[PDB]
Design a protein around this nucleic acid. Structure first.
Ligand SMILES: [Mg+2]
Ligand SMILES: [Mg+2]
Ligand SMILES: [Mg+2]
Ligand SMILES: [Mg+2]
Ligand SMILES: [Mg+2]
Ligand SMILES: [Mg+2]
Ligand SMILES: [Mg+2]
Ligand SMILES: [Mg+2]
Ligand SMILES: [Mg+2]
Ligand SMILES: [Mg+2]
Ligand SMILES: [Mg+2]
Ligand SMILES: [Mg+2]
Ligand SMILES: [Mg+2]
Ligand SMILES: [Mg+2]
Ligand SMILES: [Mg+2]
Ligand SMILES: [Mg+2]
Ligand SMILES: [Mg+2]
Ligand SMILES: [Mg+2]
Ligand SMILES: [Zn+2]
Lengths: 79, 116, 49, 182
RNA sequence: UUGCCUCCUAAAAUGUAACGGAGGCGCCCAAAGGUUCCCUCAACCUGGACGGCAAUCAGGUGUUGAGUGUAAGUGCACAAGGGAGCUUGACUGCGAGACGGACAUGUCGAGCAGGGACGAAAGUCGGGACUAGUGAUCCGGCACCUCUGAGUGGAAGGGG
């Protein structure tokens, strides 16, 4: 008697990475995901592997738009 | 030559060239050539279009040839096989209808021979 | 092997630069595509070696 | 500077008769023919696609426009058929060609049918559409007798603007198909 | 049983073992890539020659139950599904900023120049909806080079 199970994969460290209210630089990575659980918004582009990255400096602001989960970046005013 | 979709032989006497037409045979060819006055011994090399066309006109006017003939043949077969006639049952069984000696002969109707 | 490696070479300079894969059974003939050849400096047809 | 006789009849007397005898609210409630569809499925294309060539030739001769070739959207193992092969051909008639084909049909083909006992009035499907099939194709005079090798049937359907079955039945009776009386 | 990918156990950030519970991988595509344009299924009901529980046609209902080369999950009806024209960016020289980790490995990327494809234009294109389809160091082969060449000029050899 024996078992044919017991094999597994590694962990890909997926999940949201920068939460709302933070400040990010250009080219930052915000979310890593398999599918399009979230969607690109303003000043945010979608990567090759369905990852989200910022295009211009600012502050993150999660939001929704007509049946979607979207990530947006606001232009924080220059002091 | 060519007539009604039938390729007349390259070199054959008209008495059999007309026979090759499914709707006309030996004696029908003989009577047709007697009526038209055409010699029955000449070769195809001397054939001409106008006589052939008028012959086609006469045969189509007075007789039914090729597909029509087939069609009434299978129409007869289907009506007889549907009405349950003796000939219909014989066609169902694939056997002669006149009722010849099926004991040994009728291999022509029964087709090839298979042993048991 | 089904999937041999092939090398593409330019025509005028005759330098082997690019390497790809193809299915010989599906494509018995040689490949004929256009690629950028650095030394030549212009797009020219490349013929599989 | 020309107009088909059937179209003239329809736009002159048939429309007026239908309007008078049904008492419609406005002018353009009277139904009218839209299109005519002709097709046939062979089922032997899985073994021999050559007959498809003859089918297309016959369709072109009868209609005068190049027909379609249709594939199959499913694979059935019991029917020993898979994806991608051709199955049948179709064609659509509209406008002047539709009128001419309908007139030629009613004038020549139907009376020439062997053992023609009429058309069942029950062929409708409720909404005012008529469809029926044929078994033999040489009835049409446009196809010559000896050039055909095998028999091939076909199915033809007509669609009108009739709201219900009665409207379409009345319109097509006014057109004058040989209906059976029951 | 020994490596890689997916799910649950995994206690709603990441991570978390056992001879615990379930499955795949050591490929494939010269189009199943790029771009431009157009469309939406399965199922059910009603009528039609073979034709029937299912083949092709017509009408009506139909918001995701069909489909996504390959197992699972995350997604996709705006399409990433289906149909068509052109074409090889399945490039060269580069790379601001990040993603996680003991170390060596792995991953994303706006943007500039050369010369291209698509489209009237705005614009996209550094392979494939995403995650598996793979192997360090030493030694050696092949093509090229405005590198070196044991006194000098060559060559042999060594180099990128
Ligand atoms: Mg996992
Ligand atoms: Mg891509
Ligand atoms: Mg990729
Ligand atoms: Mg090919
Ligand atoms: Mg209708
Ligand atoms: Mg978690
Ligand atoms: Mg531990
Ligand atoms: Mg296994
Ligand atoms: Mg394509
Ligand atoms: Mg429909
Ligand atoms: Mg598509
Ligand atoms: Mg760096
Ligand atoms: Mg450029
Ligand atoms: Mg770019
Ligand atoms: Mg694709
Ligand atoms: Mg060693
Ligand atoms: Mg020396
Ligand atoms: Mg040397
Ligand atoms: Zn070159």
């Amino acid at each position: 008697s024996s078992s044919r199970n017991g094999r597994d994969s590694a962990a890909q460290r997926l999940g949201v990475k920068r939460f709302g209210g933070q400040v990010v630089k250009a080219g930052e990575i915000l979310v890593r995901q398999r599918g399009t659980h979230f969607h690109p918004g303003v000043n945010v582009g979608r990567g090759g592997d369905d990852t989200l990255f910022a295009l211009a400096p600012g502050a993150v602001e999660f939001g929704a738009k007509r049946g979607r989960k979207t990530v947006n970046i606001v232009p924080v005013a220059r002091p | 030559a060519r007539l009604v979709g039938v390729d007349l032989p390259r070199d054959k006497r008209m008495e059999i060239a007309l026979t090759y037409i499914y709707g006309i045979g030996r004696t029908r060819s003989n009577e047709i050539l007697a009526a038209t006055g055409i010699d029955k011994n000449m070769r195809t090399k001397d054939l001409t279009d106008d006589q052939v066309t008028v012959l086609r006109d006469y045969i189509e006017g007075n007789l039914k040839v090729e597909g029509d003939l087939r069609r009434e043949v299978q129409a007869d077969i289907r009506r007889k096989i549907e009405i349950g006639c003796y000939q219909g049952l014989r066609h169902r069984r694939g056997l002669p209808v006149r009722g010849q000696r099926t004991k040994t002969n009728a291999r022509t109707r029964k087709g090839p021979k298979r042993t048991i | 092997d089904v999937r041999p490696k092939i090398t593409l070479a330019c025509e005028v300079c005759k330098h082997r630069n690019y390497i790809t894969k193809k299915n010989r059974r599906n494509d018995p003939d040689r490949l004929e595509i256009k690629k950028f050849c650095p030394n030549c400096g212009t797009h020219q047809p490349h013929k599989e070696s | 500077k020309a107009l088909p006789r059937l179209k003239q009849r329809y736009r002159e007397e048939i429309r007026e008769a239908l309007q008078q005898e049904f008492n419609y609210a406005n002018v353009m409630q009277i139904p009218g023919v839209v299109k005519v569809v002709v097709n046939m499925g062979v089922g032997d294309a899985a073994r021999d696609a050559k007959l498809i060539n003859g089918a297309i030739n016959d369709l072109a001769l009868i209609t005068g426009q190049k027909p379609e070739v249709r594939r199959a959207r499913k694979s059935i193992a019991q029917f020993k058929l898979r994806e991608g092969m051709p199955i049948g051909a179709r064609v659509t008639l509209r406008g002047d060609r539709m009128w001419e084909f309908l007139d030629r049909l009613i004038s020549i083909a139907l009376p020439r049918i062997r053992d023609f006992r009429g058309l069942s009035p029950k062929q409708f499907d409720g909404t005012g559409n008529y469809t029926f099939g044929l078994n033999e194709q040489s009835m049409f005079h446009e196809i010559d007798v000896d050039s055909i090798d095998r028999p091939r049937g076909m199915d033809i359907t007509v669609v009108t603007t009739a709201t219900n079955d009665a409207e379409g039945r009345a319109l097509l009776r006014a057109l004058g198909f040989p209906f059976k009386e029951n």
